Structure formats: C-alpha cells, structure tokens
Amino acid sequence: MLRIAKEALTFDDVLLVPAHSTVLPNTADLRTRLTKNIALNIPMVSASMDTVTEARLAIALAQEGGIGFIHKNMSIEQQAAQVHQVKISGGLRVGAAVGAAPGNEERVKALVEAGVDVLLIDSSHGHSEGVLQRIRETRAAYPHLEIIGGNVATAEGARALIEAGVSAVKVGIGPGSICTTRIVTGVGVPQITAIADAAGVANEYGIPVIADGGIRFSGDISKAIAAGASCVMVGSMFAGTEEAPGEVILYQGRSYKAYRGMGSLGAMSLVPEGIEGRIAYKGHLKEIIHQQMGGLRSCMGLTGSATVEDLRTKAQFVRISGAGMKESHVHDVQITKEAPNY
Amino acid sequence: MLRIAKEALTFDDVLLVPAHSTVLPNTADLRTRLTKNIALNIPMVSASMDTVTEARLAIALAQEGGIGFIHKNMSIEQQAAQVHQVKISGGLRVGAAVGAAPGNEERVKALVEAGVDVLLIDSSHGHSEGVLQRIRETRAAYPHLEIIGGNVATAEGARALIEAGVSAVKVGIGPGSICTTRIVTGVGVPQITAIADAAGVANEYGIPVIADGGIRFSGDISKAIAAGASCVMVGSMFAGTEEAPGEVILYQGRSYKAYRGMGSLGAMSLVPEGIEGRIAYKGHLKEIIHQQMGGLRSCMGLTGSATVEDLRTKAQFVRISGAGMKESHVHDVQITKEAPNY
Amino acid sequence: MLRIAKEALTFDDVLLVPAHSTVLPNTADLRTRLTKNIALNIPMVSASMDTVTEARLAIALAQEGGIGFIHKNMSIEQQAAQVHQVKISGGLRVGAAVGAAPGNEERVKALVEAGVDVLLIDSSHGHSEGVLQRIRETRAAYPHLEIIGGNVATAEGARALIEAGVSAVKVGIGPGSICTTRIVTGVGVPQITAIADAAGVANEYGIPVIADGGIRFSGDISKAIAAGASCVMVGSMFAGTEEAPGEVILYQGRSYKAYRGMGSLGAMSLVPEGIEGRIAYKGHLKEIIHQQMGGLRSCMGLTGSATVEDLRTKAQFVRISGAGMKESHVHDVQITKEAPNY
Amino acid sequence: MLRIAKEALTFDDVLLVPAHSTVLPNTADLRTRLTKNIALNIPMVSASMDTVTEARLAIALAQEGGIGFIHKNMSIEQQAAQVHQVKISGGLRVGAAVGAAPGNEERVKALVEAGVDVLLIDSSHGHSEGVLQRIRETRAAYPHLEIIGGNVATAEGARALIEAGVSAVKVGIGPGSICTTRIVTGVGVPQITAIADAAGVANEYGIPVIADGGIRFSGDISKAIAAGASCVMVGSMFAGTEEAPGEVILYQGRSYKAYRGMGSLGAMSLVPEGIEGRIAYKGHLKEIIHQQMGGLRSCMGLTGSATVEDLRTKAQFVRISGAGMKESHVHDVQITKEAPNY
Numbered sequence A, B, C, D: 001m002l003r004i005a006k007e008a009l010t011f012d013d014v015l016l017v018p019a020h021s022t023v024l025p026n027t028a029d030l031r032t033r034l035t036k037n038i039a040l041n042i043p044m045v046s047a048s049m050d051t052v053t054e055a056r057l058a059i060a061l062a063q064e065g066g067i068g069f070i071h072k073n074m075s076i077e078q079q080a081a082q083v084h085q086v087k088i089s090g091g092l093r094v095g096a097a098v099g100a101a102p103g104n105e106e107r108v109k110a111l112v113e114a115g116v117d118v119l120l121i122d123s124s125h126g127h128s129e130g131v132l133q134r135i136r137e138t139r140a141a142y143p144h145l146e147i148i149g150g151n152v153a154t155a156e157g158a159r160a161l162i163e164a165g166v167s168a169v170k171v172g173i174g175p176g177s178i179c180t181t182r183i184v185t186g187v188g189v190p191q192i193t194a195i196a197d198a199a200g201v202a203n204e205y206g207i208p209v210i211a212d213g214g215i216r217f218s219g220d221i222s223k224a225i226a227a228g229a230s231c232v233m234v235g236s237m238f239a240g241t242e243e244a245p246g247e248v249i250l251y252q253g254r255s256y257k258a259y260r261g262m263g264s265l266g267a268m269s270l271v272p273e274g275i276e277g278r279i280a281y282k283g284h285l286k287e288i289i290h291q292q293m294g295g296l297r298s299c300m301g302l303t304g305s306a307t308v309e310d311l312r313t314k315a316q317f318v319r320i321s322g323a324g325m326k327e328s329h330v331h332d333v334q335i336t337k338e339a340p341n342y
C-alpha cells in the first residue's frame, strides 16, 4: 500500500573502502570531462548562483582547471558581457545559465554570440515536458552547442535528458545547503543514490554526470565521483570566497559573505524553495581548491585510483550507521584550532 | 517472542520521487473530497481544538476552500451558535466535534439543527466498541448526516469504522505536535504507515482518508496525500494565526499565541495526554494557506501529478536515512532571514 | 567473523498497536504477580537502591499495591529493622536485598526472621556459577522463601535461574538511568529484547518476569509488560519523591534529591559502574503512581487489554525509526507548562 | 550501480552479550600478545603521537604491562636516545615509529642499535605497494626484528601485510578522536567490522591484530578484543596524562593538555588529516590504566571470559540501534559528580 521504490543513500551513509594502491597523492590524475567535448583539469564546477558565480570567480576557477556557470539573475546584456569577460581572459572556458520558462531565446542567442562554451538550463525540472522540449528547441537552433538541461534525480530523468540531446546530465533535487525544496515540497532523492541511478543510464552513452548539491567536505567530492559523477557542482564550498560576488561583512570578530538560494525570496525579487544566509569568509578560491583537491588526491592514494575514471568506476563503498559517521568526524576532544579543510 | 507486526514509517523517513511532468504549479488541481458527499477546493481541514478552530477560523478556512471543525469545549448553545455563524456567512460549510462518551445526543441534535455539514466524533478511540456503537446510533438517528468517527491507525480500525457507517476515516494516534499519547501510553503508529494501512481498506470503498496530526511543513502535506489521504487535518500549522482563538502575546520582541493539546490539563479543566505551549504568531491564515498550498503545487509539478488523486494513487516514495533528512533541510549555513514556509 | 547474534531493541524502538477495545481506562484490571506466590495490585516494584527504597517508601508503595525492596547498604540490624517496620504497618508485604558475594548467610537469616516476604540477590551476575549456587544454598536453607536471583538479559540466563529454584526472573543488564555498566564494560542487551528473551523461557514455567531498569515514562511500563514482563522495577521514576531517602535540596529556584547508582563510588564507600546525580523533586509517591498507572490504564483502553496478562501476551508492537520516536514526543512547539507525566 | 560491498559497524552499534560465567573480575587473566614473539601483561599500547608517547609514558606504560611506541617527530638521534632510555629502565620493552616514505633506513638502523623491540611503519597506507615493499626491505635487513606495517581496514590489506612479513597487523583508517581522514578523503571502514575482517585472515596465521583508534571508554576495549583484536592502541585515552608530553594548561578552573593528530598542520610543521585540540587533564597514567582494565575485567566477569583469547574468540555481540546506545549511557538524570571512568 505504501508505494516505496527502494532505500536511498546520501554522503553520510557511506564510506569508500581503502584498496591496493600504487598511487601517491601527488601522482593522482585529476583530469575529467564536463561533456564529451569539454574536458576539465579538475572535477569542479561552480553553481549558477548570484552569491557564487560571476566573471571574477569564473575566471579564477577556470584558471584552476574547473568551469564556472554565470548566473541568470541579471540582464541579457550583463550576462553576455560577463561571458565575454571570461572568454577574453586568455583561453578560458565558461558556462552560463538560463531559466526553464519560455521566452529565453534572445538570452541564449546573446550568450552564444558572446562565445559561451556550454549552456545550462538551470532548473529542478529536468524531467518535464517543458524542459525537454526547450532542450530540443535549443539543440535544433545550435547543433554544436554543448547543453546541460534541468536537474534530475532518477534513471528515467537521465534517459529523457539524453534522448532530448543533452551533452551532460546534472543530478540533484534539493540536496543544497541553503535549499528547502525537499522540505517545502516533500520531493527529492538522497544524492548518492541519485548520482548512481543517473550514471547507470548515462554510462551506457558515455555521457558525463555532474553531481550538483550537498557537497560539504572534500570527502563528499570523492564519494560523488565514486557514485558515478565525472565532476561536482558546488555552491556553499565556493560561497564566501573573495572571488564570489558580494562584500565581506564583519560581525563579532568574524567575517562572512551572503549566500542564498536562487529560490529564496531575495534572489527571486511567492513561495520560496531556499533561504538567505551568511557563510564564513573563506579567503581566496585558489587555496580552497588546493585544500579540496588535496583531499581528493589523498582519497585516490588510499583507494588506489590512478585517475578519476578509476575512482568513478572501480572504487567500492561500505554502508555505515550514524555511529560510523560520528566516528569519522572529530570526536571526544576539544578543537583549539580550525583546520583549513574542516 | 517479541510480537512485532512490521517497521512503520513517518514523514521524515520518506521522500517523494520526481517523475515525468506536464504539470506546472499554477495548473495543478487541488480539489479533493472530505467525504463522498462533501468536496473541498483545497486538501486542508482544521483541528477541533480550543486553540485552533472557532467560527472565525472556520469561516476564513472555508473561504480558502477547506473546512473547519468547531471544537467541543464549550456549551451546547455556544457550539450551535458558532456553527450557525459559519453557515450564515455566504454558502460556507462547517464541521463540529463531539466527544466519545455517552450523553452527547442533545449536543448532536443542536448541531444538526444549526446546519452542521459534518459531525466528528473527536477521539483516539475509533477502534472501540463504544465509539463504533455511537456511530451506529448517530447514523440511525440521522441517516443523511456525514459522520467522521474516532481516529484509527490500522487497516482493521478503518474497516470497523466503515462497517459502522462513517463517511470518512480519520487517521492518527499521537503524532500531534503538542501531544504525548505515545509517550504516556506507549501506543501509536508512525503516521505514513498508518495512513497507507487505512487507505488500503478505505480505497476499496471509495471512502476518503483524512490524515490527522504530525504535519509540520508543506512537504508533509504532499507525503500524507501520497500515502493515501484525500486531505489533511492540522492543528500546529494553523495555531498562532490571527484567526485562531486567543490573543497575541508579546515576549522578548516576538509574538506568540497559546497552543495546547485537548488532553492537556488546561483544556480538560487527571492524567493528561498533551501539553500546554505557545507557538510563534503566524499572521493571517490566508497567507499561511497560500504558502502551504504553494508547496503542494510545487510538489505536484515535480511529481507530474495533475490532480490530488494522481498524487494520492500514483506518486512513489523512496525510503531515506537520518542523513538523507539532514540533507533535505538547510545544512552547513547560517540562516539570516526566516522564510515564510520554513 | 563478527559474531553477532541478532538486532536487539529497546523502548524507543517500538510502539504498541491500537486494537479493538471494550476496555475503558477505569475498568482496566492492573493486578499481576511478582512471583507465583506473591500477587500485586499494581505492576510496580521499587529498586533496591540507597536513594530509592527504605521503609518509608516501601510502606507507601505497598499501600498503593506494589512492593519495595529495602536496599543492602546498611547493617544487618538496620535492614532487619526496616523490614520489621514495614511488616507491622498493617498487612503490608516487603522485599529485601542482599549482595552476591559469599558471607551473607547471617543477613539472610535476620531478614527472614524479621518477616521478609521475598529475598532479592541484588546483582548483575545472574548467569554466574556463584549466584546460581547462592540461590541453591538459599533455597535449601529456606524451602518456602520466595527468592529473586541476580539479573539476567538472555533466555539462557533465565533458564539457569529457574533451574536453580528462583520464584521470579529479573531482567536488566545496564539499562538504568544512572548506570554505566554498558559503557564501562561494553556488556548489555537492549531491554525490550532482553525481557522478551527471558519471557520466552519463563512463560513455559509460569514464572513471572520483572523488567528492571530503563523505564522513563509511563509508556515504557506498557511496553515492558507487552514484551513479557509481569511487573516493572523502577529507580529513577521513584527517586526524588518525598518518601524516597534523602533531603530536598533547593538550587536556583528548583528542588532536587540525590539519586545515584549502587555501583557509584559514593554508594560503594574502585572502578564504578554508575554515577552520582540529582533528580528533580517529584512530590509524594501517591501522585506519581497515580500518573504512571493512569498512563498504563489509558494504554490498556487503546490496546483493548482487559488485564495485565492480556497486555503481556496479546498486544502487538510496531518497529519504528528515530523519526517515529521524535513524532511521538512533543515536537515543533514551545512547552510553557510541565505536565505531571511528562 | 552503487558499488556497496556490505554494512559495516562501529563500537556504538554493538553490545556484548552476558553469558555463563565462572570468572570474577579479580581472577580474569589480562595477558595477551602484541606479536608472536612479544607478550603483553595487559592489552594496551600507546599511539605513536607527539602528544602521547615519549620515553616517560613508554616507561610508565611498560611498567603497567603494555608497550609504548615512541613517535617519529624528532631527530634520529633523539628517537634512538628515547628508545635507549626506556631499555635501560629495568627490563622494559619499547617500540618506535618511522614513516612510510623512502629514506628512513638510517633511522631504522639507529633504532635497532638502540635496542628497539618492535618497529612500526606508522601510516594509513598499509595496502600500498610502497609500504609493502618497505616491509620486505626491512625484513631482509633485519630478519629477526618484530615489524608492524601501515594500518589497514580490510581482509585483503591484512593478507598483504602478512605476506610481506609483518609480525602483527594494525587496523584503523580514520577512527581516531582527533582525526579527519574520513571526512577529508571519504575513505574508511567502521572499526568493529575493520577489526573482524582483518582478524578473519590474521587468525589463520596466528598473527595478532592491534585495534588502533576510536577507543573512547573502557567498554570499547572489550568490544575491540571481542571483534578479534589481541590488543588496542590508544591516543586520546592516554593523552592528557601526567606522563604524556606537554605541560598542563589551566583554563577557567580546569586543567588540560594539548592533543593533536599527526596529520594536523602543527604536527606536520599542506592538506591536513587531523586537528589540534586540548583534552582534559587525566592525572597519572597508572590510575587511568587501573580504571580501564577494571572495566575490561568486569566485562570478562559478565561474559565468562577467563582469558583475553576467550573474549577474542568466543564472546558474542548483539546489534543495537541508536536508542539502545542512549539507554547504555547515563540518561534522564543530572550528573553531579564526574566518575573516573566516565
């Protein structure tokens, strides 16, 4: 009577199993794919959010081997200009977002004319007739444009996007840090299972999966890749960097920047699907990426994964309980110094 | 040796799976049934509680497409008068509660004479000889009166109520926010399983199930409907509105109203089965309903549920762990603004 | 490789399922057995602890239909005198504790001479050669003395005690509120499973099981009985009453009494297996018993259990998750008044 | 699609089952093995950490029947001198650590010349070509030197170490109190399962398993042994003792010592895998060992384990839920005095 499809898992439900290794962290190969036609030197892309990615962060991230997605909460002229600013900064790639609603044809044309490398239809509605037909329309108009459609969280959603013509499948319905879709609507799929379910289909086509949302610690990047993702999209992890939009706010001896959902009231201007918040100031993006990729390298040394494909297709998990996750964190000790990756 | 019937689930144990959709939130159809003979434009009814539903809230709720149940903690004359006040307010429907104990015949007669649309026998003892024979007596005296009996939490309880002649089955033993039945007695069934178990029987008869208690967020409304309920009954979600009984209380810069169980000592005047509390002031009921139904509409857009029946009979769940629920909430960020639906 | 016998449950893992009922709380029959030869009017006995049971509480409890166990942390003459004081208070029954170590023969003789109704060998070592041979020695010396041996937590422990000649089996290794055996030693069995496992054996002999430790709320009493216990032993629930030993301590506007484990350093005067604490002052034992038995009566009304035997042998459980237990408690509301049973 | 090998358990997921006993705590035999050739009078060894083990603690621990591992964060001359200082203190055994990287030949030679009893290659990379070939090189150079290699967390890791020539297998990837490997990398195995998996292989060879990390309470020592370990390695439990390195720090009326991971930035001088912290001051190591071994003795009395081998090979577990662990701790009472083992 209760129509329950299966028990789905998230990052804190699993750990990666150490295995025979010939890999040292400094020899690990971090290269991967965003699409069949767009390679990345590291498996990180930035969220299309108004508190994460404008040209400044997109440039810095691309210089580190990732790609940024310029957010849609600005005029067409402004967004095209940001794309152009990244493109003229010496051989760098950039993406840009547009919404799922009809009437974005002019915006897409302007972004393409500005040299955008990949268009994102930025939505939770990947498995909808509207988004699928938007993808088909876009693929007709731009036969050689790399396209990522709305997010999905299932095998059938991934298949539908692929059949519509996307270049990569992005996975995540409500796992975001600043996000309340799952609470407001009741809808979502724990992210590890969501990634694996999508990958089971996408792998058949050689189409990359992008794991979007819920990444808190560098270890979550490893887990997302092992679940089947070719790369991760992050908001919180990059929010609060110097390069992210917004000024640094001093409060009670500590520094912060604003970070908000794109379905928050502030971002939309209504029934919101995110909140408005503040996040500790992180310093420069370069050091954050170094910390995060250091964790992933150390993972690859422990799992014996020479490349991201090895991690993505060969590494094994164990299922854990809540006590297992409490043991994984610091426990039974007072932390006197905050570590740069914790 | 341990007589354990099965593992039962509640709202936070499950999420709804996104599916193919042709539904936009503004095209979703929220109409449903309270009984075979009483339709609702939205799937919400208010609790028969002395801190939730008197005529003022019953009127406002009926104007929004729901129905209120006037509580029993007042004299017969007062309760009939409240019913009458809702009935003369332009085409509005109303319910009213009576207790399970013998001797309520005069009260029932007065409520019927005042034009009550549906009588509720307001109790946790739906599966008891007393309540079942009270239903039979009432159905004999008023062959055309819509009747809802005591609450149940099982398939057999639902069957018994149906065989006694009820017009809808209401489900919930102790899930309420302000309620302690399960702690004081040890008795209850997690609400998602309770709803599904009742619905498995009630569906055979075309008899609506009402999911009563434990609804905290709009996403819980979606889940209750998908578990099999035609509509939800809420106390906490409407307590604290301007229209609910009681005055607004200012304390340390914030406003509150009283909210208490009907088995609390205060409400009964003894071994209580609820507590007395205060709840943040919510403003006008209209905006709360708009927020809550906005969440449900957004659910229906994501699940592809065109109607409440589609959600109730076709949408699928996934089982989740505690980590999955922590990911669903806001996490790893400081909330600087409270959202109207969170 | 990991020798794991099975997954064991405690009170918060389960709820009782409501069933057809002809029972009202005021008609429920609370009578039960402590042993085949000692009946109780209510299913409650007090812990043999120096912060719970001396003559004053033993008298008050016996007047309410239970039995107290006078603790062993006093001289032989003092303990015999306390027994005598309960016996001369008009037809009342009393128990008394002795430790498991050799050399307690004189103490046992003095307690028997004072008229003790039941002797408890007060220990966690029920399944030990020493305790079993102590029981055999005692049964030889006093062929008609009701005897309860050391605690057990397994079927085989219960069988061994029965074969040694006990009159009741007491179950509980480390579930106590003030107790640390499970943390210090790593040994124990979650109490619901422990009770059921013991009862599976004891039921074959018609020998009562006493559920000792871990009872926090009245609903836990219901659950212990449904798991197979004929009655419960409580420390925390009665500590802090006016009748318990110790003076009332005022601190920051609230009143307390001391409550400590019998393996705490304070009680022993070493490697302790309990702690020293304070518990809120509860008032008179009579009102506490009324609240606790009111909860049990309300359970019996909901489960349709006319007698304690019906609850003990017929009522069904459902297994629940942590979300199910959070729903059972008060949730999402501020408690402005503390209820007498919560 | 999700490559999940099995559900793995940690200390708080399990309890030991009481069994028939002829063992009293004072008759329990605590003797065990560190290697086939090195016996221990108690099953405790100290972590090779710069805030746990230098000569002073190594001497005190060896006098109590354990063995200390002098940490590697000092010059060769200094480390050899510390070894020598323990060796000349009247018949005492000592170990010493070296890192996994090439170029430690001189350090090993100096430690051997100073009389070290056992060499530890102190690493998380036990299952790596580098560590395995380091073990082989060392075994070639010192055919009669007791060697422990890098840590492992799997059956295959244990087999590989054994085939390379180790004298004991040490188990633990990231369970440490002050440690963040699992969070930073995503890699690890809950410690109870890790120990059992290693032991399943090591038992075939008669090779001891050492359970390293995650031990918080004395009951965890019992559980590690029952999972298959011959002895435990502890950092937190001994940090903060008078004999551990570092001065006592007074802060707000309480005393502390520093305790930090060996992958913390402070210890390494970078992407750290531990943190820097402070731990409450514990007093002299002798009393801590007495408390911890008192807990283990009490376990052995309850499980009927006459020897450590009996506990290690015969004692049974039950799986528990989070409610079972909450019952095991102190609950529902205010602790007015801190117990020496809690």
Ligand SMILES: NC(=O)c1ccc[n+]([C@@H]2O[C@H](COP(=O)([O-])OP(=O)(O)OC[C@H]3O[C@@H](n4cnc5c(N)ncnc54)[C@H](O)[C@@H]3O)[C@@H](O)[C@H]2O)c1
Pocket: A048, A099, A100, A101, A122, A123, A124, A125, A128, A130, A131, A151, A172, A173, A174, A175, A181, A261, A262, A263, A273, B021, B023, B024, B025, B298, B301, B302
């Ligand atoms: N990945 C997620 O779980 C998630 C969820 C909500 C919001 N968001 C973020 O917020 C922004 C808005 O995302 P969104 O579009 O999912 O939020 P949304 O559900 O508010 O939809 C936004 C617009 O798209 C159209 N739309 C609404 N429901 C639709 C449906 N069921 N099918 C097709 N089209 C529909 C409407 O025109 C609407 O104004 C984006 O920047 C996105 O990244 C993400």
Ligand SMILES: NC(=O)c1ccc[n+]([C@@H]2O[C@H](COP(=O)([O-])OP(=O)(O)OC[C@H]3O[C@@H](n4cnc5c(N)ncnc54)[C@H](O)[C@@H]3O)[C@@H](O)[C@H]2O)c1
Pocket: B048, B099, B100, B101, B122, B123, B124, B125, B128, B130, B131, B151, B172, B173, B174, B175, B181, B261, B262, B263, B273, C021, C023, C024, C025, C298, C301, C302
């Ligand atoms: N849905 C729930 O889980 C729940 C539980 C307790 C109270 N309540 C609320 O509190 C109020 C009282 O509800 P209640 O009647 O369940 O509380 P209750 O158990 O206190 O019963 C109230 C009255 O009904 C009769 N009654 C008591 N036990 C009975 C039984 N086992 N069978 C038949 N009749 C019995 C008695 O005359 C009693 O005074 C109502 O407004 C109700 O909504 C709800």
Ligand SMILES: NC(=O)c1ccc[n+]([C@@H]2O[C@H](COP(=O)([O-])OP(=O)(O)OC[C@H]3O[C@@H](n4cnc5c(N)ncnc54)[C@H](O)[C@@H]3O)[C@@H](O)[C@H]2O)c1
Pocket: C048, C099, C100, C101, C122, C123, C124, C125, C128, C130, C131, C151, C172, C173, C174, C175, C181, C261, C262, C263, C273, D021, D023, D024, D025, D298, D301, D302
């Ligand atoms: N039910 C429990 O889980 C539990 C646990 C510890 C203490 N206690 C309470 O504390 C008091 C002491 O109880 P306890 O005796 O279990 O604590 P314990 O384990 O400290 O034993 C106390 C005495 O009994 C003897 N003893 C010790 N270990 C034994 C063994 N393995 N087999 C046989 N005899 C042994 C010794 O002489 C010892 O001094 C009692 O009042 C009891 O209620 C209860």
Ligand SMILES: NC(=O)c1ccc[n+]([C@@H]2O[C@H](COP(=O)([O-])OP(=O)(O)OC[C@H]3O[C@@H](n4cnc5c(N)ncnc54)[C@H](O)[C@@H]3O)[C@@H](O)[C@H]2O)c1
Pocket: A021, A023, A024, A025, A298, A301, A302, D048, D099, D100, D101, D122, D123, D124, D125, D128, D130, D131, D151, D172, D173, D174, D175, D181, D261, D262, D263, D273
């Ligand atoms: N048991 C654990 O889970 C754990 C984890 C991290 C650190 N530590 C502690 O911190 C210290 C450093 O331990 P570590 O060496 O595991 O930390 P690590 O991963 O930082 O490695 C330290 C050095 O060993 C070499 N190394 C790095 N990765 C390697 C790999 N994949 N295979 C082979 N060699 C590699 C490098 O030269 C590196 O500088 C030790 O004292 C150790 O006890 C323990």
Ligand SMILES: O=c1[nH]c(=O)c2[nH+]cn([C@@H]3O[C@H](COP(=O)(O)O)[C@@H](O)[C@H]3O)c2[nH]1
Pocket: A047, A048, A049, A172, A173, A174, A175, A176, A177, A178, A179, A180, A181, A182, A212, A213, A214, A215, A233, A234, A235, A236, A237, A260, A261, A262, A263, A264, A273, A274, A275
């Ligand atoms: O449910 C949502 N409501 C929102 O308001 C919202 N805004 C962003 N997003 C999504 O969250 C991702 C960022 O997540 P993290 O901060 O966890 O990296 C992003 O990359 C998006 O997928 C939203 N999701």
Ligand SMILES: O=c1[nH]c(=O)c2[nH+]cn([C@@H]3O[C@H](COP(=O)(O)O)[C@@H](O)[C@H]3O)c2[nH]1
Pocket: B047, B048, B049, B172, B173, B174, B175, B176, B177, B178, B179, B180, B181, B182, B212, B213, B214, B215, B233, B234, B235, B236, B237, B260, B261, B262, B263, B264, B273, B274, B275
């Ligand atoms: O166990 C109970 N003790 C009480 O004192 C009590 N009062 C109300 N109710 C029930 O709780 C429902 C309201 O629940 P929410 O606040 O969660 O919406 C209501 O609609 C009722 O079903 C009670 N349940």
Ligand SMILES: O=c1[nH]c(=O)c2[nH+]cn([C@@H]3O[C@H](COP(=O)(O)O)[C@@H](O)[C@H]3O)c2[nH]1
Pocket: C047, C048, C049, C172, C173, C174, C175, C176, C177, C178, C179, C180, C181, C182, C212, C213, C214, C215, C233, C234, C235, C236, C237, C260, C261, C262, C263, C264, C273, C274, C275
């Ligand atoms: O592990 C233990 N260490 C102790 O120091 C201790 N003292 C009492 N007891 C046992 O706890 C029971 C009382 O438990 P409650 O307070 O939960 O009712 C009692 O009835 C005893 O079974 C102890 N258990």
Ligand SMILES: O=c1[nH]c(=O)c2[nH+]cn([C@@H]3O[C@H](COP(=O)(O)O)[C@@H](O)[C@H]3O)c2[nH]1
Pocket: D047, D048, D049, D172, D173, D174, D175, D176, D177, D178, D179, D180, D181, D182, D212, D213, D214, D215, D233, D234, D235, D236, D237, D260, D261, D262, D263, D264, D273, D274, D275
């Ligand atoms: O992940 C790690 N990062 C670190 O920085 C670190 N330093 C020590 N160790 C390991 O932790 C063990 C001590 O653990 P406890 O404090 O829990 O006894 C030790 O015995 C080591 O196995 C580390 N692990």
Ligand SMILES: [K+]
Pocket: A327, A328, A329, A330, A331, D174, D175, D176, D177, D178, D179, D180, D181, D182
């Ligand atoms: K850890």
Ligand SMILES: [K+]
Pocket: A174, A175, A176, A177, A178, A179, A180, A181, A182, B327, B328, B329, B330, B331
């Ligand atoms: K979220």
Ligand SMILES: [K+]
Pocket: B174, B175, B176, B177, B178, B179, B180, B181, B182, C327, C328, C329, C330, C331
């Ligand atoms: K509740």
Ligand SMILES: [K+]
Pocket: C174, C175, C176, C177, C178, C179, C180, C181, C182, D327, D328, D329, D330, D331
């Ligand atoms: K306990």
